[model samples]
Target: MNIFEMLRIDEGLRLKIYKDTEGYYTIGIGHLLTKSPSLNAAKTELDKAIGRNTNGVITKDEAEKLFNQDVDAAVRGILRNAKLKPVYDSLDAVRRAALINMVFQMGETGVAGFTNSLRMLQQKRWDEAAVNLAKSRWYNQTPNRAKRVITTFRTGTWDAYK
Candidate 1:
């Protein structure tokens, strides 16, 4: 749906923006399991993925311009690949939304690198994935933000697959 809203950042949204853009630059699963994604060109590449084809040439400016587009597509692509019926499909609203937030922040496959978390993803293990989401390097790196998302995901019903 709405990437910005899904991310739901605010002045006090627990984590400070890293501004590396690389953190947000990473494409989701589509960027993974395939070509190396734009070195710093996720936007143009997404354009190509959507049929615009930069013809092997894209700039950082263009990439940044498409940050929201690429990231949104990346998340959609992850769910599409995960079978649209994978762990996400089975989740309730809370857990699913929380996982999406985690995946959104961490990048789909990058987030999946967590052995425990990936295992849960592969098995449609929503509960375990939720736990794995909290026990990540990011969690260690941004405990407040991580905790917030964990709470969002655990909102009594695990409905997060959005």
Candidate 2:
């Protein structure tokens, strides 16, 4: 597989793709980036409201409060999405970042909608999921956003651009 054409190599290798602020595309991998938190305020508010949970880890009211705070922190850009379980499902760290960055943008439900990714995910196909992760048209319309996430995916650290 030529590195020039493929996004996620069939060999399960990671490659970096980029888009400038002016909206130009390039292939460049291996740079520093940041992490994101899994939850979002909108989703958090809803989840917290459904405080019927009793995980035995915390009281329902306390759990809701903590969940709300965690959600706020996640969406507020304070916490990181890198630690997310689903994102980390990938064996490659770069792929994990890629998954979480997608979640960071789409929120939980948004990332969940990647039926293709989900299929790959259920099968525990890391590279396949990463490849499917690149299939979305979001990269075409919001190349910058896509690049930012791509960069984040490659590098677990967040960057100034995003």
Candidate 3:
């Protein structure tokens, strides 16, 4: 894919200066031209390309394109990692998807940090795994999401916690 095209789509074709997701002043297709510059120039050249003050918008489809590469990277990371590989290969697709989602939210190390949960999963102790999962900090931090993950692991049905 063309880098410029990607920027035009994923970052939106803005015609003026506006704050980005992290609140930095940006302009013209996700350019991170901050208010403070190295040269202390009044204009960051981006402001010259597009006008200033007013921001612009892009299509929903275009905006959503930004996540594709990230999702792909997460998928690859889960598949390739030695720690996640065993469970990922052993589980059904739905279960695998849940695992990947968890891994995506928490890095591979983060998920692997759940030692007891992994042990139960490896032992095919589905009930114990669910119980273990529910007892963790991950569960406490995100109750509904944790319940859904635990339910999926326990029941093997994708309609988890619905």
Candidate 4:
């Protein structure tokens, strides 16, 4: 994948440790398994898990590696979903990347839940595919991003947004 695509996903994932909307100590490519009461504690826990110093920080390159690995695994998983075989094969690179990006955000199973979207994709109905994408709960979670994804799926073009 291109650096541009990687940057697109990273913008959504955010490459740092901070508080989420709920004040949780989330960090590092959206890694949120740490149960630290504070940001310091969260970083310590993450450091320990990765065998880094307790006060160490996750570098941008390190976070990008993890994100790339996650996306790779997600793409492999999407390939295994029998339900979306035809849809997957019919997609152009931009549409394929959109599907991969969705799989990255929601996981393979989560994207697989968009039955209407998949059906529209399988039938090569670009307009309906965009509409179906907009109808997902994921769409509601991030309208700006969902719109970009819909545009990618519908027009087969990648648009960069910060």
Candidate 5:
């Protein structure tokens, strides 16, 4: 599957406002509305996107649009990181998707904090990279998702999708 489709499954499509794992007010395929400069701005954006102000609900089309935008932003942020670009360029598509999946959940800076893991990845040490990632607190926070991402990194395959 494509990166967007993979993320759709992993992140789960939510049409209404809900608290994410970190308790952030999020909507539309893991879009963290609470991350907006202000709650009012977030609500306004949601209202405008959904074309209504009543409830925190959105259509599938709107959700998909927001999801795409978020994925784009994540990709741009990952690429913009000087330390990540070369490593990202060296990865195959499946491995690239795994890296993007990590950035999607944790943000570019967060993923960049995996210094040793990133070094392993840059050196093409797949198993070491996976092991390093598995050792992180991120793994403890979301073990299931982390396992899937780590497996993708180690195997360089789409087996995680299964």
Candidate 6:
């Protein structure tokens, strides 16, 4: 499966603005409004996407557009990382998607901090990589999603999507 399909399941959709688990002001499939370049710029894009002034609401199509942008950014962010490039390149498609999912959830810097896990992945030690991921605060924060991603890393398959 593609990143969009996976993220749609993981992030879920929201037409209204809501607080994420970490309490950030987010909307439209986990788009962090608070972390946007500027609230005004974000509002403009949302409004434009929805074809009207969306004070705090969005349509499914609008949300999908934002999701696309966010996923693109996440992919670029991962690919642009000097240290992550080789490790990411060595992985298979499923494993690569798992890495992208991690970056999407936590940002590139956050994923990069998983030094041991990344090293394990780089060495093609699937179990060790999964073990290291399970030991993180990120895994503790979102156990279900973490389990799915870790399982993907371990099996190198899309079974987690089931």
Best by lDDT: 6
**Local accuracy of candidate 1 as per-residue lDDT tens digits, 1-162:** 333455544111211111232344333321321233444455454556545654434454443444456566655856775543366666666556556666655567765566666566556555666687776678787777676666555453423424
Top TM-score prediction, candidate number: 5
lDDT of each: 0.51, 0.42, 0.61, 0.69, 0.85, 0.86
Off by over 4 Å in 1: 1-3, 10-18, 21-68, 83-85, 118-132, 156-162
Which 10 consecutive residues of model 3 have the lowest summed lDDT? 1-10
- Which digits, one per residue and each the tens of the lDDT, describe model 3 over residues 37-151? 4322324444343444212433444333433554566678877878777877888766776676677556688887887787788677999899888887778876776777677
**lDDT of model 1, residue 107:** 65
Model 6 pairs whose backbones collide: none
Candidate 3: Cα lDDT at 149: 67
Candidate 5 runs further than 4 Å off: 35-42, 48-54
Which digits, one per residue and each the tens of the lDDT, describe model 6 over residues 1-162? 877788888999998877788876778898877655455766766676567889878888888888988899988998899878888999999899999999998999999999888999999999888888899899999999999999999999989898
Q: Estimate each model's TM-score.
A: 0.50, 0.35, 0.61, 0.77, 0.91, 0.89
The alpha-carbon lDDT assigned to residue 140 of candidate 2 equals: 70
Tens-digit lDDT track of model 4 for 108-154: 78888888889888777999888878876778877777787788778
Q: Rank the candidates by lDDT, best first.
A: 6, 5, 4, 3, 1, 2
RMSD in Å for all candidates: 7.9, 15.8, 9.4, 3.4, 2.3, 2.8
CA shift at 139, candidate 6, in angstroms? 0.7
lDDT-best of 2 and 6 = 6
Model 6 misplaced stretches (Cα beyond 4 Å): 35-52
lDDT computed for candidate 5:
0.85
